[PDB]
Design a protein around this motif. Structure first.
Motif, PDB file in Angstrom:
ATOM      1  N   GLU A 123       0.671  -1.283   0.000  1.00  0.00           N
ATOM      2  CA  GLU A 123       0.000   0.000   0.000  1.00  0.00           C
ATOM      3  C   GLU A 123       0.704   1.345   0.000  1.00  0.00           C
ATOM      4  N   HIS A 124       0.136   2.219  -0.814  1.00  0.00           N
ATOM      5  CA  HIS A 124       0.458   3.597  -0.672  1.00  0.00           C
ATOM      6  C   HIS A 124      -0.395   3.906   0.544  1.00  0.00           C
ATOM      7  N   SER A 125       0.071   3.420   1.690  1.00  0.00           N
ATOM      8  CA  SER A 125      -0.501   3.721   2.992  1.00  0.00           C
ATOM      9  C   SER A 125       0.714   3.835   3.829  1.00  0.00           C
ATOM     10  N   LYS A 126       1.804   3.273   3.350  1.00  0.00           N
ATOM     11  CA  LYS A 126       3.022   3.548   4.058  1.00  0.00           C
ATOM     12  C   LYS A 126       3.572   4.763   3.326  1.00  0.00           C
ATOM     13  N   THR A 127       2.807   5.195   2.325  1.00  0.00           N
ATOM     14  CA  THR A 127       3.163   6.303   1.467  1.00  0.00           C
ATOM     15  C   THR A 127       2.058   7.365   1.467  1.00  0.00           C
ATOM     16  N   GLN A 128       0.795   6.949   1.524  1.00  0.00           N
ATOM     17  CA  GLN A 128      -0.314   7.907   1.643  1.00  0.00           C
ATOM     18  C   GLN A 128      -0.153   8.652   2.980  1.00  0.00           C
ATOM     19  N   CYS A 129       0.557   8.013   3.910  1.00  0.00           N
ATOM     20  CA  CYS A 129       0.843   8.578   5.223  1.00  0.00           C
ATOM     21  C   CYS A 129       2.124   9.393   5.157  1.00  0.00           C
ATOM     22  N   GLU A 130       3.172   8.776   4.632  1.00  0.00           N
ATOM     23  CA  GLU A 130       4.442   9.444   4.408  1.00  0.00           C
ATOM     24  C   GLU A 130       4.298  10.785   3.690  1.00  0.00           C
ATOM     25  N   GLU A 131       3.746  10.755   2.487  1.00  0.00           N
ATOM     26  CA  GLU A 131       3.789  11.924   1.604  1.00  0.00           C
ATOM     27  C   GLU A 131       2.757  13.009   1.896  1.00  0.00           C
ATOM     28  N   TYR A 132       1.533  12.587   2.147  1.00  0.00           N
ATOM     29  CA  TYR A 132       0.479  13.558   2.215  1.00  0.00           C
ATOM     30  C   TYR A 132      -0.007  13.906   3.629  1.00  0.00           C
ATOM     31  N   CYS A 133       0.549  13.236   4.638  1.00  0.00           N
ATOM     32  CA  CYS A 133       0.184  13.486   6.043  1.00  0.00           C
ATOM     33  C   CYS A 133      -1.300  13.392   6.311  1.00  0.00           C
ATOM     34  N   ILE A 134      -1.969  12.462   5.653  1.00  0.00           N
ATOM     35  CA  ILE A 134      -3.406  12.346   5.842  1.00  0.00           C
ATOM     36  C   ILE A 134      -3.705  11.353   6.947  1.00  0.00           C
ATOM     37  N   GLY A 136      -5.614   8.917   9.225  1.00  0.00           N
ATOM     38  CA  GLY A 136      -6.632   7.947   8.961  1.00  0.00           C
ATOM     39  C   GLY A 136      -6.155   6.542   9.172  1.00  0.00           C
ATOM     40  N   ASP A 137      -7.099   5.701   9.578  1.00  0.00           N
ATOM     41  CA  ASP A 137      -6.797   4.333   9.876  1.00  0.00           C
ATOM     42  C   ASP A 137      -5.577   4.344  10.759  1.00  0.00           C
ATOM     43  N   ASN A 138      -4.620   3.506  10.432  1.00  0.00           N
ATOM     44  CA  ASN A 138      -3.448   3.416  11.255  1.00  0.00           C
ATOM     45  C   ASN A 138      -2.399   4.468  10.985  1.00  0.00           C
ATOM     46  N   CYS A 139      -2.724   5.459  10.161  1.00  0.00           N
ATOM     47  CA  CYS A 139      -1.806   6.573   9.952  1.00  0.00           C
ATOM     48  C   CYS A 139      -2.287   7.647  10.883  1.00  0.00           C
ATOM     49  N   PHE A 140      -1.408   8.138  11.743  1.00  0.00           N
ATOM     50  CA  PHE A 140      -1.805   9.069  12.811  1.00  0.00           C
ATOM     51  C   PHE A 140      -0.649  10.040  13.041  1.00  0.00           C
ATOM     52  N   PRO A 141      -0.451  10.935  12.080  1.00  0.00           N
ATOM     53  CA  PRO A 141       0.847  11.591  11.913  1.00  0.00           C
ATOM     54  C   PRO A 141       1.147  12.698  12.860  1.00  0.00           C
ATOM     55  N   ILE A 142       2.428  12.980  13.079  1.00  0.00           N
ATOM     56  CA  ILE A 142       2.825  14.017  14.003  1.00  0.00           C
ATOM     57  C   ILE A 142       2.993  15.256  13.172  1.00  0.00           C
ATOM     58  N   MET A 143       1.997  16.135  13.281  1.00  0.00           N
ATOM     59  CA  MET A 143       1.977  17.416  12.603  1.00  0.00           C
ATOM     60  C   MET A 143       2.980  18.349  13.229  1.00  0.00           C
ATOM     61  N   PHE A 144       3.579  19.222  12.425  1.00  0.00           N
ATOM     62  CA  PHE A 144       4.514  20.215  12.925  1.00  0.00           C
ATOM     63  C   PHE A 144       3.835  21.508  13.311  1.00  0.00           C
ATOM     64  N   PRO A 145       4.277  22.073  14.425  1.00  0.00           N
ATOM     65  CA  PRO A 145       3.973  23.416  14.900  1.00  0.00           C
ATOM     66  C   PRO A 145       4.287  24.526  13.947  1.00  0.00           C
ATOM     67  N   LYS A 146       3.584  25.655  14.065  1.00  0.00           N
ATOM     68  CA  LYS A 146       4.035  26.820  13.323  1.00  0.00           C
ATOM     69  C   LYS A 146       5.328  27.278  14.051  1.00  0.00           C
ATOM     70  N   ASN A 147       6.319  27.707  13.269  1.00  0.00           N
ATOM     71  CA  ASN A 147       7.692  28.073  13.730  1.00  0.00           C
ATOM     72  C   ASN A 147       8.642  26.887  13.859  1.00  0.00           C
ATOM     73  N   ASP A 148       8.171  25.676  13.563  1.00  0.00           N
ATOM     74  CA  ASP A 148       9.060  24.528  13.603  1.00  0.00           C
ATOM     75  C   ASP A 148       9.940  24.545  12.391  1.00  0.00           C
ATOM     76  N   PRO A 149      11.244  24.653  12.569  1.00  0.00           N
ATOM     77  CA  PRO A 149      12.172  24.528  11.461  1.00  0.00           C
ATOM     78  C   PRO A 149      11.931  23.354  10.518  1.00  0.00           C
ATOM     79  N   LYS A 150      11.551  22.181  11.021  1.00  0.00           N
ATOM     80  CA  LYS A 150      11.367  21.011  10.170  1.00  0.00           C
ATOM     81  C   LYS A 150      10.372  21.226   9.013  1.00  0.00           C
TER      82      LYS A 150
END
Ligand code: HEM
Ligand SMILES: *[C@@H]1O[C@H](CO)[C@@H](O[C@@H]2O[C@H](CO)[C@@H](O[C@H]3O[C@H](CO)[C@@H](O)[C@H](O)[C@@H]3O)[C@H](O)[C@H]2NC(C)=O)[C@H](O)[C@H]1NC(C)=O
Ligand SMILES: *[C@@H]1O[C@H](CO)[C@@H](O[C@@H]2O[C@H](CO)[C@@H](O[C@H]3O[C@H](CO)[C@@H](O)[C@H](O)[C@@H]3O)[C@H](O)[C@H]2NC(C)=O)[C@H](O)[C@H]1NC(C)=O
Ligand SMILES: *[C@@H]1O[C@H](CO)[C@@H](O[C@@H]2O[C@H](CO)[C@@H](O)[C@H](O)[C@H]2NC(C)=O)[C@H](O)[C@H]1NC(C)=O
Ligand SMILES: *[C@@H]1O[C@H](CO)[C@@H](O[C@@H]2O[C@H](CO)[C@@H](O)[C@H](O)[C@H]2NC(C)=O)[C@H](O)[C@H]1NC(C)=O
Ligand code: CA
Length: 595
Positions: A123-134, A136-150
């Motif tokens: 699956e593009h689920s190890k990629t739908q998560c990687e690339e688009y930060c969406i 859902g399901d077992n993708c539960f991504p760590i969003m970056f803060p405003k002012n975060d250099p990353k």
């Protein structure tokens, strides 16, 4: 508990009930409840899970559902404001060697592992998560803060995948979601031998019937053993340097090569198994291949239990030790030997104990070459520096001569781990262990911090002033309140680690209670605890009280100068004696005469 029988995970097999040896899986330790403490079952729940929808959705998932009236702060923002620091100067623990940090990771890995949900090599689920930060399901991504250099440099989030849960892997229908522990709760050296019927066997050397573990065949460390390479490409150890092309090590536990120093430790342990087995053949020539294996195994397990219980816990728990772990009174069949879900975050305190660099030292304990000190971040899944840089002797002396990092309310987790972590699935050194650990409390439905103070019978602050008094720090207490807005909402990992240390210990009151209780139970609940009457003989027991990590070093490397107490800070050469002098494990109590 009690929707009482669920769970297909479970490997399915039978108990001997008169076998002198632990199973590989942990099954059959407990007689009336044979699966208690086995691998591949749910982590225990000392308190009820707390999920956003009460069943399985983590807090922070639905953007407008609050916890107690407030928004939980972003994992990574808590990381940036509280966890990080810039200056490594002054951060070293004056009274704990690097090995202190390191034994802790061995013990934790023998005890618990909640692996991520994988759910497809497709699956593009190890990629739908990687690339688009969406999310859902077992993708539960760590969003970056405003002012975060990353943001400027990496993308919009860090990929994160929810941990595995019992019964399935598909979206389960109904109870309350429980995470799997994939290893045995009993301190049994499952990290050397494997927790599965499948792996345990592949690791053994079944060509010769000397009960040896398999060793690397492609490479040697001055005629000493290395771990076998792992079969599986793609290999992250191969990825970090595609020129060297050296794969990760194959060991009893999957995380063995997360870091050169941990892989080092595994090597010492494999080596002691073979050493112990060949020694045993010498004493009992009639002894069988299986018996050789089971008996070395049994000894290695006793050894880890001893170093852990005699040398390591007293200097983590400090004065609190004896109030949680009284002296052993014998096996108690009523004690629940299972690792609890919260223990796997409490034990994460070791993350604040990790320094920014690692050293290789030469035989005079001097800087070994010109590139002697390395930044930690180049050692994640780095096995090439072992095999193509002088073996483990140089790292092993670094373990004894260098110090752990001291937990410190202002300098909490090193950037080496907070910014530059390499995850075995993605390409960049750019993950945050701190944020991860936070996202993971939420993933596991942990109760917040006041629930745990309550559980351990400690006061529960409800105000800034309350919090300062407990934490004994105005600044830290206000950062937490600004972010969390109520102490009830403080994620356990950072609540637990923000407390000052107890006397002689390396964790605070909350952690000492949680750590303390777990260890008491895994020892009182273990039919095979080394002091349990009838497991070893009085005479065998007498010979095992002499084990020491220094000996282990002497017998398994070419180091001839060691400290007597390896876990405290030791300066070479004053604190360093001749290997030729350290108590040896007298191994004759194991003789067997048939007339
Ligand atoms: C790199 C990492 C380490 C050193 C450079 C390191 C070290 C430790 C020590 C010394 C621990 C105990 C004293 C300890 C505890 C636990 N860890 Fe951690 N660790 C490194 C990296 C990781 C990573 C990555 C994880 C995965 C986290 C996740 O949720 O995905 C990790 C886990 C744990 C863990 C939980 C184990 C479990 O039940 O799954 C500890 C108790 N470590 N580490
Ligand atoms: C650096 O840390 C050291 C290890 O924690 C610490 O010493 C240890 O302190 C404990 C506390 O009681 C002692 O434990 C044993 O003491 C006597 C030996 O004199 C024994 O007979 C007792 O039965 C008891 O178990 C030890 O004295 C010691 N532990 C070791 C290694 O044996 C140091 O004091 C610390 N250094 C500083 C300056 O803080
Ligand atoms: C990928 O791994 C490579 C080897 O595993 C490593 O290259 C090696 O490291 C250094 C180069 O910086 C060299 O070490 C020394 O070796 C000889 C002795 O025979 C000296 O005379 C040289 O002057 C040199 O100092 C190794 O020769 C070199 N090996 C190879 C194959 O070139 C790389 O550094 C690794 N790359 C990365 C980015 O990690
Ligand atoms: C299984 O054990 C055997 C016996 O120890 C190993 O073979 C010996 O060890 C090395 C390996 O090349 C050499 O001394 C000899 O070739 C072997 N000697 C004997 C007595 O047979 C073998 O390496 C082990 N197999 C694995 C994969 O670990
Ligand atoms: C064995 O350990 C269990 C672990 O839960 C202990 O539980 C006790 O249960 C008994 C009832 O039979 C009571 O004494 C207490 O309610 C529990 N103890 C306390 C104070 O927590 C028990 O202590 C142990 N049992 C034996 C026989 O040693
Ligand atoms: Ca274990």
């Amino acid at each position: 508990s009690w929707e009482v029988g669920c769970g297909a995970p479970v490997p399915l097999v039978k108990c001997d009930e008169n076998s002198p040896y632990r199973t590989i899986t942990g099954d059959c330790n407990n007689r009336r409840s044979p699966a208690l403490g086995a691998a591949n079952r749910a982590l225990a729940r000392w308190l009820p899970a707390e999920y956003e929808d009460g069943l399985a959705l983590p807090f922070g998932w639905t953007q407008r559902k609050t916890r107690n009236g407030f928004r939980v702060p972003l994992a990574r923002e808590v990381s940036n404001k509280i966890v990080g620091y810039l200056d490594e100067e002054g951060v070293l623990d004056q009274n704990r060697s690097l090995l202190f940090m390191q034994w802790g990771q061995i013990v934790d890995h023998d005890l618990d592992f909640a692996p991520e949900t994988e759910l497809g090599s497709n699956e593009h689920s190890k990629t739908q998560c990687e690339e688009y930060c969406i999310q859902g399901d077992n993708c539960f991504p760590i969003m970056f803060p405003k002012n975060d250099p990353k943001l400027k440099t990496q993308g919009k989030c860090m990929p994160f995948f929810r941990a595995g849960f019992v019964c399935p892997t598909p979206p389960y229908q109904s109870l309350a979601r429980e995470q799997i522990n994939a290893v045995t709760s009993f301190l049994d050296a499952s990290l050397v031998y494997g927790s599965e019927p499948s792996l345990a066997s592949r690791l053994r050397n079944l060509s010769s019937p000397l009960g040896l573990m398999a060793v690397n065949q492609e490479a040697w460390d001055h005629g000493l053993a290395y771990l076998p390479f792992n079969n599986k490409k793609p290999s992250p150890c191969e990825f970090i340097n595609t020129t060297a092309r050296v794969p990760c090590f194959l060991a009893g536990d999957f995380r063995a090569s997360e870091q050169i120093l941990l892989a080092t430790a595994h090597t010492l342990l494999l080596r002691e198994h073979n050493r112990l087995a060949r020694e045993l053949k010498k004493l009992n020539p009639h002894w069988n291949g299986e018996k050789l294996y089971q008996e070395a195994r049994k000894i290695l397990g006793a050894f880890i239990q001893i170093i852990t219980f005699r040398d390591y816990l007293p200097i983590v728990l400090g004065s609190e030790m004896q109030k949680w772990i009284p002296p052993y009174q014998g096996y108690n069949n009523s004690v629940d030997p299972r690792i609890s879900n919260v223990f796997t975050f409490a034990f994460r305190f070791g993350h604040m104990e990790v320094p920014s660099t690692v050293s290789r030292l030469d035989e005079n304990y001097q800087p070994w070459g010109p590139e002697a000190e390395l930044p930690l971040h180049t050692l994640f899944f780095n096995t090439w520096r072992i095999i193509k840089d002088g073996g483990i002797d140089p790292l092993v002396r670094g373990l004894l001569a260098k110090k752990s990092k001291l937990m410190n309310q202002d300098k909490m987790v090193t950037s080496e781990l907070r910014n530059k972590l390499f995850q075995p699935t993605h390409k960049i050194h750019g993950f945050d262990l701190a944020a991860i650990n936070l996202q993971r409390c939420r993933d596991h439905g942990m109760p917040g911090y006041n629930s745990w103070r309550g559980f351990c019978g400690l006061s529960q602050p409800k105000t800034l002033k309350g919090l300062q008094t407990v934490l004994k720090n105005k600044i830290l207490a206000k950062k937490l309140m600004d972010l969390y807005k109520t102490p009830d909402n403080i994620d356990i990992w950072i609540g637990g680690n923000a407390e000052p240390m107890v006397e002689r210990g390396r964790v605070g009151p909350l952690l000492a209670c949680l750590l303390g209780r777990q260890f008491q139970q895994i020892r009182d609940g273990d039919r095979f605890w080394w002091e349990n009457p009838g497991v070893f003989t009085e005479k065998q027991r007498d010979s095992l009280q002499k084990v020491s990590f220094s000996r282990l070093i002497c017998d398994n490397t070419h180091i001839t100068k060691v400290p007597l107490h390896a876990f405290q800070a030791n300066n070479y050469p004053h604190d360093f004696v001749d290997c030729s002098t350290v108590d040896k494990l007298d191994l004759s109590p194991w003789a067997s005469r048939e007339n």
